[PDB]
Amino acid sequence: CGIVGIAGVMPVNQSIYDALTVLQHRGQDAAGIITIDANNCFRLRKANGLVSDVFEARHMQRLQGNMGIGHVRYPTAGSSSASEAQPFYVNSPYGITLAHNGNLTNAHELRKKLFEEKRRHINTTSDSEILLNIFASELDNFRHYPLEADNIFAAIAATNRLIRGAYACVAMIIGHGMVAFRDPNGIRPLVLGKRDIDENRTEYMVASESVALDTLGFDFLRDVAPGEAIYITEEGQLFTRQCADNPVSNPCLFEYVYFARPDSFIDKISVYSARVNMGTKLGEKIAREWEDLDIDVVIPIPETSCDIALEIARILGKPYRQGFVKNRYVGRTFIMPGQQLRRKSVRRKLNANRAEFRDKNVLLVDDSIVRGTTSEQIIEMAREAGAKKVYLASAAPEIRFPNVYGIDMPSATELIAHGREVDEIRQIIGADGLIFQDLNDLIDAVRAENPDIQQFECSVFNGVYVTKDVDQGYLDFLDTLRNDDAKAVQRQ
Amino acid sequence: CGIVGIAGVMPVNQSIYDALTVLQHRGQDAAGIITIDANNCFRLRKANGLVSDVFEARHMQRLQGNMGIGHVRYPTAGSSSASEAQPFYVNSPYGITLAHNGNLTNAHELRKKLFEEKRRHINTTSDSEILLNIFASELDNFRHYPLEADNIFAAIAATNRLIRGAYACVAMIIGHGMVAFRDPNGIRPLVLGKRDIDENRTEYMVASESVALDTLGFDFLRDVAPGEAIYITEEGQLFTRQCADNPVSNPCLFEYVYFARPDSFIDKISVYSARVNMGTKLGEKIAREWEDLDIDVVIPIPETSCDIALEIARILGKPYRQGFVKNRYVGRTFIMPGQQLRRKSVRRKLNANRAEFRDKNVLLVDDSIVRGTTSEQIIEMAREAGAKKVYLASAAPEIRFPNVYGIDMPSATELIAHGREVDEIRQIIGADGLIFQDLNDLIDAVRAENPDIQQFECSVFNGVYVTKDVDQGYLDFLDTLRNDDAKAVQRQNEVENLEM
Amino acid sequence: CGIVGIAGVMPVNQSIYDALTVLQHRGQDAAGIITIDANNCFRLRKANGLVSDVFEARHMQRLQGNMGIGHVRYPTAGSSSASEAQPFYVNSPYGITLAHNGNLTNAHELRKKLFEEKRRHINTTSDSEILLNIFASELDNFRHYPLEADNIFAAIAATNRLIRGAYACVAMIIGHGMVAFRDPNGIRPLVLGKRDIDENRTEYMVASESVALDTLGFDFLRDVAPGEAIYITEEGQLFTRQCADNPVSNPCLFEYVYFARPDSFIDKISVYSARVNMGTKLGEKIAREWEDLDIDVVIPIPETSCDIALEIARILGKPYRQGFVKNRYVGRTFIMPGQQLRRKSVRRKLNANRAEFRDKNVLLVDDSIVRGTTSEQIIEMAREAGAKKVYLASAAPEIRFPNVYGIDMPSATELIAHGREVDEIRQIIGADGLIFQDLNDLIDAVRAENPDIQQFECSVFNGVYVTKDVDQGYLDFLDTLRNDDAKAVQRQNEVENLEM
Amino acid sequence: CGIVGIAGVMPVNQSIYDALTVLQHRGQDAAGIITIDANNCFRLRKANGLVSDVFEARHMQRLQGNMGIGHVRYPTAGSSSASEAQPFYVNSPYGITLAHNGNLTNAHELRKKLFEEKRRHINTTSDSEILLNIFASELDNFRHYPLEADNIFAAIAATNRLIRGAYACVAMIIGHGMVAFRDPNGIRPLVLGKRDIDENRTEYMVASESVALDTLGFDFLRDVAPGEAIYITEEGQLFTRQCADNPVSNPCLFEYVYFARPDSFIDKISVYSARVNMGTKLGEKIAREWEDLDIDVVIPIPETSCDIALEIARILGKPYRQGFVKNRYVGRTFIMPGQQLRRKSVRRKLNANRAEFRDKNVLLVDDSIVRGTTSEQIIEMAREAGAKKVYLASAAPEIRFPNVYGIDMPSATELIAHGREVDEIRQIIGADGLIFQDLNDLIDAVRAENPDIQQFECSVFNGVYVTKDVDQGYLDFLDTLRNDDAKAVQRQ
Ligand SMILES: O=S(=O)(O)CCN1CCN(CCS(=O)(=O)O)CC1
Ligand SMILES: O=S(=O)(O)CCN1CCN(CCS(=O)(=O)O)CC1
Query: Per residue, what are the HEC states of A360-383?
Result: CCEEEEECCCCCCHHHHHHHHHHH
- Residue in C61, C120, C124 nearest the CB of B492: C61
Say if the Cβ atoms of A215 and B262 lie within 8 Å.
no
Neighbours of C290 (CB within 10 A): 16
Final resolution, Å: 2.0
| Gap between the Cα atoms of D163 and A457, Å rounded | 55
| Pairing of the two strands D433-436 and D390-394 | parallel
Neighbours of C355 (CB within 10 A): 17
Residue A412, C-beta contacts closer than 8 angstroms, at least 6 positions apart: A400, A401, A402, A418, A475
Beta bridge partners, D179, equal: D171, D231
Peptide bond into B93 cis (omega under 30): yes
| Gap between the Cα atoms of A378 and A392, Å rounded | 10
- Ligand 1 lined by A46 (C-beta under 6 Å): yes
| Gap between the Cα atoms of B408 and B393, Å rounded | 22
Say if the Cβ atoms of D332 and C24 lie within 8 Å.
no
Q: Are C408 and C76 in contact (CB under 8 A)?
A: yes
- Distance (angstroms) between ligand 2 centre and the Cα of D31 equals 12
Q: Minimal CA–CA distance to C205: which of C240, C178, C243? A: C178
Residue range A276-326+349-400+412-445 in CATH 3.40.50.2020: yes
Neighbours of A358 (CB within 10 A): 12
Closest ligand by atom to D87 CA: 2
- Ligand 2 lined by D45 (C-beta under 6 Å): yes
Residues making up the annotated binding site of D are 304, 366-367
B125 Cα to chain C: minimum distance (Å): 10
Please name the residue of chain C whose CA is at the shortest distance from the CA of residue A338: C491
- DSSP code per residue over D360-378: --EEEEES--SSSHHHHHH
Task: For residue D89, give the H/E element and its range.
Answer: strand D88-90
From chain C, the residues in CB contact with A336 under 8 A are: 495
Ligand 1 atom 8: residue of nearest CA: A47
Domain ranges of chain A: 1-275+401-411+446-480, 276-326+349-400+412-445
- Ligand 2 lined by A44 (C-beta under 6 Å): yes
| Gap between the Cα atoms of A375 and D298, Å rounded | 84
Say if the Cβ atoms of D335 and B491 lie within 8 Å.
no
- Ligand 2 lined by D43 (C-beta under 6 Å): no
From chain A, the residues in CB contact with C500 under 8 A are: 491-492
**Most B-contacting residue of A17, A53, A321, A327 (CB-CB within 10 A), to test interface:** A327
Query: What is each CA distance from D489 to A64, A356, C253, D130, D373, in whole angstroms?
Result: 14, 61, 48, 22, 22
CATH class of B1-275+401-411+446-480: alpha beta
| Cβ-count burial D231-259 (b if 16+ within 10 Å, e if not) | bbbbebebbbbebbeebebbbbbbbbbbb
Q: What is the DSSP letter of C268?
A: T
Nearest atom in ligand 2 to the alpha carbon of residue D82 is 3
- Ligand 1 lined by D43 (C-beta under 6 Å): yes
Ligand 2 pocket mutation pick from A33, A40, A41, A45 by most atoms within 8 angstroms of CB: A45
| Gap between the Cα atoms of A463 and C119, Å rounded | 74
Q: Are C125 and C83 in contact (CB under 8 A)?
A: yes
Nearest atom in ligand 2 to the alpha carbon of residue D59 is 16
Q: Are D255 and D460 in contact (CB under 8 A)?
A: no
From chain B, the residues in CB contact with D336 under 8 A are: 495
Say if the Cβ atoms of D119 and A61 lie within 8 Å.
no
Say if the Cβ atoms of C355 and D325 lie within 8 Å.
no
**Most D-contacting residue of A42, A61, A123 (CB-CB within 10 A), to test interface:** A123
Ligand 2 pocket mutation pick from D16, D33, D43, D46 by most atoms within 8 angstroms of CB: D46
**SS3 track for chain B:** CEEEEEECCCCCHHHHHHHHHHHHHHCCCEEEEEEECCCCCEEEEEEECCHHHHCCHHHHHHCCCCEEEEEEECCECCECCCCCCCCEEECCCCCEEEEEEEEECCHHHHHHHHHHHHCCCCCCCCHHHHHHHHHHHHHCCCCCCCCCHHHHHHHHHHHHHHCCEEEEEEEEECCCEEEEEECCCCCCCCEEEEEEEECCEEEEEEECCCHHHHHCCCEEEEECCCCEEEEEECCCCEEEEECCCCCCCCCEHHHHHHHCCCCCEECCEEHHHHHHHHHHHHHHHHHHHCCCCCCCEEEECCCCCHHHHHHHHHHHCCCECCCEEECCCCCCCCCCCCCCCCCCHHHHHEEECHHHCCCCCEEEEECCCCCCHHHHHHHHHHHHCCCCCEEEEECCCCCCCCCCCCCCCCCHHHCCCCCCCHHHHHHHHCCCEEEECCHHHHHHHHHCCCCCCCCCECHHHHCCCCCCCCCHHHHHHHHHHHHHHHHHHHHHHHHHHHCC
| Gap between the Cα atoms of A475 and A460, Å rounded | 13
Q: What is the DSSP letter of C87?
A: P
| Gap between the Cα atoms of C82 and C84, Å rounded | 7
| Cβ-count burial A183-207 (b if 16+ within 10 Å, e if not) | bbbbbbbbbbbbbeeeeeebbbbbb
Catalytic residue among C1, C169, C243, C458: C1
Residue B287, C-beta contacts closer than 8 angstroms, at least 6 positions apart: B315, B316
| Gap between the Cα atoms of A189 and A169, Å rounded | 10
| Gap between the Cα atoms of C77 and C69, Å rounded | 23
Beta bridge partners, B390, equal: B362
D321 Cα to chain A: minimum distance (Å): 47
Q: What is the DSSP letter of A92?
A: S
- Long-range contacts of the stretch D288-294 (C-beta < 8 A, 24+): D289/D435, D290/D391, D290/D433, D290/D435, D293/D361, D293/D389, D293/D391, D293/D433, D294/D361, D294/D389
- Ligand 1 lined by A47 (C-beta under 6 Å): yes
- Using an 8 Å CB-CB cutoff, list residues of chain A that contact chain C: 334-337, 491-492
Say if the Cβ atoms of A337 and C491 lie within 8 Å.
yes
For chain A, how far is it from start to end, CA to CA, in angstroms?
Answer: 22
Closest ligand by atom to D39 CA: 1
Q: Are C30 and C48 in contact (CB under 8 A)?
A: yes
From chain B, the residues in CB contact with D334 under 8 A are: 495
Task: For residue D133, give the H/E element and its range.
Answer: helix D127-139
- Ligand 1 lined by A44 (C-beta under 6 Å): yes
Phi, psi of D137 (to 5 degrees): -60, -35
Where would I find the H helices in C247-344? 253-254, 271-289, 306-316
Ligand 1 atom 11: residue of nearest CA: A84
- Ligand 1 lined by A81 (C-beta under 6 Å): no
**Is B18 labelled as part of a ligand binding site?**
no
Say if the Cβ atoms of D335 and B500 lie within 8 Å.
no
C-alpha of A122 from chain center: 24
Q: Are D30 and D54 in contact (CB under 8 A)?
A: yes
- Ligand 2 lined by D46 (C-beta under 6 Å): yes
Say if the Cβ atoms of C57 and B120 lie within 8 Å.
no
**Burial class (CB within 10 angstroms; exposed 0-12, middle 13-18, buried 19+) of D126:** buried
**Is B304 labelled as part of a ligand binding site?**
yes
Phi, psi of C381 (to 5 degrees): -55, -40
From chain B, the residues in CB contact with A263 under 8 A are: 322, 325, 351-353
Residues making up the annotated binding site of D for Mg(2+) are 304, 366-367
> Determination technique for this PDB entry?
X-ray
- Distance (angstroms) between ligand 2 centre and the Cα of D92 equals 19
Please name the residue of chain A whose CA is at the shortest distance from the CA of residue C494: A337
| Gap between the Cα atoms of D210 and D220, Å rounded | 7
- DSSP code per residue over A121-174: ---SS-HHHHHHHHHHHHHTT--SSS--HHHHHHHHHHHHHH--EEEEEEEEET
- DSSP code per residue over C127-160: HHHHHHHHHHHHHTT--SSS--HHHHHHHHHHHH
From chain C, the residues in CB contact with A492 under 8 A are: 500
Q: Minimal CA–CA distance to A226: which of A182, A163, A265? A: A182
Say if the Cβ atoms of D335 and B499 lie within 8 Å.
yes
Catalytic residue numbers of B read 1
Say if the Cβ atoms of D492 and B500 lie within 8 Å.
yes
- Ligand 1 lined by A370 (C-beta under 6 Å): no
Amino acid sitting at position D148: E
C252 in active site: no
- Distance (angstroms) between ligand 2 centre and the Cα of D68 equals 19
Nearest atom in ligand 1 to the alpha carbon of residue A59 is 4
| Gap between the Cα atoms of B100 and B109, Å rounded | 19
Q: Minimal CA–CA distance to D231: which of D263, D202, D206, D199? A: D206
- Residue in D337, D491, D492 nearest the CB of B495: D337
- Residue in A211, A327, A336 nearest the CB of B61: A336
| HSE-up of residue C164 (Cα within 13 Å, Cβ side) | 13
